[PDB]
Amino acid sequence: LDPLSEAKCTLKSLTVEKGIYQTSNFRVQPTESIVRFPNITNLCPFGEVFNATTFASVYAWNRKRISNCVADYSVLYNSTSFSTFKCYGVSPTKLNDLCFTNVYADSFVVRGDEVRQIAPGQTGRIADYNYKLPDDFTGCVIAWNSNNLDSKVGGNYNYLYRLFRKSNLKPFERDISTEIYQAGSTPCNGVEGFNCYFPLQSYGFHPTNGVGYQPYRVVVLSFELLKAPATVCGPKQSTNLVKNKCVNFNFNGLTGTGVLTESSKKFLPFQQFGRDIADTTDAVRDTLEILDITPCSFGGVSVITPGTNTSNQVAVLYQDVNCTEVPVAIHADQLTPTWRVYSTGSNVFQTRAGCLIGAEHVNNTYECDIPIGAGICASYQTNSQAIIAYTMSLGAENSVAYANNSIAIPTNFTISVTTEILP
Amino acid sequence: VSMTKTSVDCTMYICGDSIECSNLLLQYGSFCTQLNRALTGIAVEQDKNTQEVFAQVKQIYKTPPIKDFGGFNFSQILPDPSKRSFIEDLLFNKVTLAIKQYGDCLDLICAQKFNGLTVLPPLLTDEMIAQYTSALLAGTITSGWTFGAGAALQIPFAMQMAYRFNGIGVTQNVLYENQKLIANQFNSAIGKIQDSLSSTASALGKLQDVVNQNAQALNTLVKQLSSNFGAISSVLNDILSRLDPPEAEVQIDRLITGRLQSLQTYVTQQLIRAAEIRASANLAATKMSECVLGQSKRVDFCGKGYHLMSFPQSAPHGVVFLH
Amino acid sequence: NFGAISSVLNDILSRLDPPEAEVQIDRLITGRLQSLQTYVTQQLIRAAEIRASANLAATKMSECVLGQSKRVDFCGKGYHLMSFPQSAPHGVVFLHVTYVPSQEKNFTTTPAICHEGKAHFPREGVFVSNGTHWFVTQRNFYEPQIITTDNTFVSGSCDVVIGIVNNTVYDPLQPEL
Amino acid sequence: NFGAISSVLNDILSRLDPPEAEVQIDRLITGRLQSLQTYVTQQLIRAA
Amino acid sequence: VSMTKTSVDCTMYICGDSIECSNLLLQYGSFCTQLNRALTGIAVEQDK
């Protein structure tokens, strides 16, 4: 509400003594919100991934690529039901306000029991010899039951998996060879006899099987977030760019509060964001221009109070603002009506420390009472009662009558007693 | 004598403009007030340090117009019509220091100012300190040591020097029979001091180290904001934009703990340095009282030899004594 | 809270199993240990300053109370005579007694007196005049005395001294007898 | 231990995957950094 | 008059010979340099 209320809140007391005090912000609150997203109206294909008639085998997965689309997934609600859906690196409630980079979709069919093995840090035949996921995996895993499409009355034997391998697979690596695994010594030479096995084996999917045996279609989505120029986004609507104010900008899924100004920085074609010494973002490509974000608050503010026991009147000092530049600096016109009074007034004086508002300037020099700094002090005095700001006096002035043939001799003395206190 | 006074905005350094971070910082428990009290104590002590050394006498004596001192020449140390002397100008130019406005920056200083780190101005400007030192010089060269006691008593300069030669154990007539030679030696010594100062070589490394230390500490604070501290990123917007508030709390708490530790290390080392600066200020106040206001018999206190007199000059953040 | 669900240990313990409770209790332990360590460090920093002040007050007890000090402004402002201690809560108080000259007078002075081609310098004091007569007086009090060969020693010749004047030295012995 | 499963880095590394191991190693790093910083501060206080 | 001068190897005290710990210490953000500067100042002061 007030500079004095700022001081009271900062000090954690209802009474404020005489003194100049540093204050925190509290004054400014953001109220607006802009949105900027690319011009993409081609909906992603949720019909040619999920609805595909034929799926791959787990030993040879599809690895499809996606780009230039909007990723609105509610269009699936009516058509399909997922028994598994889990995301890594991102929360499922933010998926509609983000723009994804390097999107890939992997697809295959497993049995119901082995769905749990499609996760980072697992073991088993599918994780070991068929499909492996990185430890630092960002993306989502979706799986649903397909016992209506992948099961035949006589049996479906067209899905295969690898049972024997010399060593574990690395992440996102594929193996489609069909050599003969050699269980022991005595090399095989393709005979496929004893201790020599064909490595691929076939799932047998009958309609009347247990839920664990029943076929499960699996899709894995891989992407990157807030790292590079993106192309797949989310259903949102761009808004006008309110400039030169404290707003929430939400540029391409990156959110925050700040002020936007033009920049001369030049970006290589694979760069969109820029970070400074404190590692926070400062430059954002928007038109393809590069803009610059600047914080909402800047500089320090001080409050001079003759004490709450005496009066509720105060003076305010702005340390980094030349006067007439104060309203733009402190973001006036969004502050409460009481706080605006200080921004502009008749009692405006420019000192070396900054600009002082609320104190009257006199032409006399007294001893310091409340130090404002750079040679300026302030005092509560009558004129009625007011806060005055003056220049401190170093002391009284005189001179010595010097002459080459003159001396001064004392004629009397004084015995003085003084006290010194020491802890 | 003194060091720079600083202030820190705890919430702007840790959280920025994030409301969610501010709420979490309230829940966390804030000891920012203790840090602010420590810094405010430091600043008040620095002003007190400056006051003690220079504001000892509150009578502003003025330089004598006649300037007839029996052949001793003080033009290089007396002011010249910011009213600083020749040697004080040289000293102020040998030290390279480190109103900024929102329009001005929209440079390291504004990188500090955007993160809550501000620097406060001293109470006494340099003109005031030069007035203090010129008052001391005038008082000493006119009334000798008497002004220190309480009341200035004029005395011809050669008489003062005779009483100083008696002070060190040489009789008066040694000064009165060698007056012109001694005046010439003093003038030549002042000339050599001026020539040494005007050379490229700097003897004021003690006063430069203070500036370097302050700048280094404030820049280390700003560089230390890029540390992840075990979180997914060091930027709060990336954590907030990609994660739900329950998930985001753990990462934001990690960042809060790290940045609080950084602020507390800065404050502790500032207190440790303020103690040393206070020791040096006390030493320079004892030397102002005993070498300038009086003739000292302590050995090697006011230089090497037998002490005769001393003169002060003001320098950026410090004082210089000519013994 | 320090990032835990609550700042009370009973709420954490009553509502959670020991494996779940360990993480919250560890958060609280870390926070409270940090608080204790900050308290201790600032206590050490203050103890150093108190020790400095105690050393100063012991030097002042030795030199201002047990002896007469010639250091300037050590035992107060003026010329030191003596001091007395008093005890105060957590500290000491010194009453310093000093001598302050006053009631000044302007005189004319000279470096030396030339009598018969010999310069004469005071043994202790300074030559002063009231405008008609020349006397010798001590520096810090006005006590004029007639210039005699016991007040002033003789050395050199008159020419070297820049401001020498002409006057007479009494030479007590010969005129009295 | 500083809240980790053990105070030996080999036990943490040998028995756990790198994503799981990161949290325990971060706990140990924070604790040991605090120990070094306490040592340094008290050394400065004694040097004065 | 003086005290002992010491030096600390931050990575060898915290991590040892573990590459994984060293990578995590790089990611964490290292203020070891500040500790080393404080200790070096102490040593120079002791010789002075």
Ligand SMILES: *[C@@H]1O[C@H](CO)[C@@H](O[C@@H]2O[C@H](CO)[C@@H](O)[C@H](O)[C@H]2NC(C)=O)[C@H](O)[C@H]1NC(C)=O
């Ligand atoms: C990549 O290929 C190499 C060569 O085929 C594989 O290395 C073989 O690994 C087996 C399993 O231990 C050894 O018995 C062979 O002696 C290795 N070959 C050689 C030439 O050293 C390697 O395993 C393959 N990588 C993966 C991830 O399967």
Ligand SMILES: *[C@@H]1O[C@H](CO)[C@@H](O[C@@H]2O[C@H](CO)[C@@H](O)[C@H](O)[C@H]2NC(C)=O)[C@H](O)[C@H]1NC(C)=O
């Ligand atoms: C005291 O010293 C100053 C500085 O040297 C003298 O002033 C200069 O004297 C020289 C003599 O050759 C002149 O050329 C300069 O123009 C003078 N002024 C300056 C600013 O250098 C001054 O004369 C000396 N006082 C005396 C000799 O009584």
Ligand SMILES: *[C@@H]1O[C@H](CO)[C@@H](O[C@@H]2O[C@H](CO)[C@@H](O)[C@H](O)[C@H]2NC(C)=O)[C@H](O)[C@H]1NC(C)=O
């Ligand atoms: C300076 O002091 C001398 C000595 O006290 C003064 O001389 C005396 O003046 C009084 C005036 O009544 C005479 O009675 C004395 O006989 C004088 N003494 C001598 C030795 O002659 C002198 O008058 C003083 N001058 C001034 C201007 O005060």
Ligand SMILES: *[C@@H]1O[C@H](CO)[C@@H](O)[C@H](O)[C@H]1NC(C)=O
């Ligand atoms: C999926 O494919 C079937 C068979 O062609 C078709 O009837 C159905 O409409 C498709 N659904 C979508 C959403 O493409």
Ligand SMILES: *[C@@H]1O[C@H](CO)[C@@H](O)[C@H](O)[C@H]1NC(C)=O
């Ligand atoms: C939802 O799916 C069912 C399944 O066939 C369909 O009959 C219905 O029309 C769908 N809803 C809408 C609004 O089309």
Ligand SMILES: *[C@@H]1O[C@H](CO)[C@@H](O)[C@H](O)[C@H]1NC(C)=O
């Ligand atoms: C995107 O839409 C805006 C709407 O004004 C248009 O100006 C712009 O040319 C379009 N294309 C690009 C690449 O920005």
Ligand SMILES: *[C@@H]1O[C@H](CO)[C@@H](O)[C@H](O)[C@H]1NC(C)=O
């Ligand atoms: C104070 O001094 C300034 C500068 O000379 C002058 O402009 C102003 O009118 C003076 N005001 C008063 C009240 O004397």
Ligand SMILES: *[C@@H]1O[C@H](CO)[C@@H](O)[C@H](O)[C@H]1NC(C)=O
């Ligand atoms: C010295 O001062 C005291 C008290 O002020 C006064 O009684 C005394 O007469 C003075 N002596 C002279 C010589 O003036």
Ligand SMILES: *[C@@H]1O[C@H](CO)[C@@H](O)[C@H](O)[C@H]1NC(C)=O
């Ligand atoms: C402030 O504004 C005035 C008016 O233009 C200008 O003369 C002055 O240089 C500016 N800066 C300062 C520090 O006064």
Ligand SMILES: *[C@@H]1O[C@H](CO)[C@@H](O)[C@H](O)[C@H]1NC(C)=O
């Ligand atoms: C000495 O004379 C000067 C002027 O010649 C005068 O200002 C001063 O007050 C005199 N001294 C005393 C103690 O009166």
Ligand SMILES: *[C@@H]1O[C@H](CO)[C@@H](O)[C@H](O)[C@H]1NC(C)=O
């Ligand atoms: C004192 O100065 C005057 C000039 O002001 C000069 O005539 C006189 O000789 C000087 N006296 C001495 C003792 O130097």
Ligand SMILES: *[C@@H]1O[C@H](CO)[C@@H](O)[C@H](O)[C@H]1NC(C)=O
């Ligand atoms: C002192 O006496 C001598 C000889 O009579 C004379 O030459 C000299 O000028 C006198 N001194 C003064 C200052 O008059």
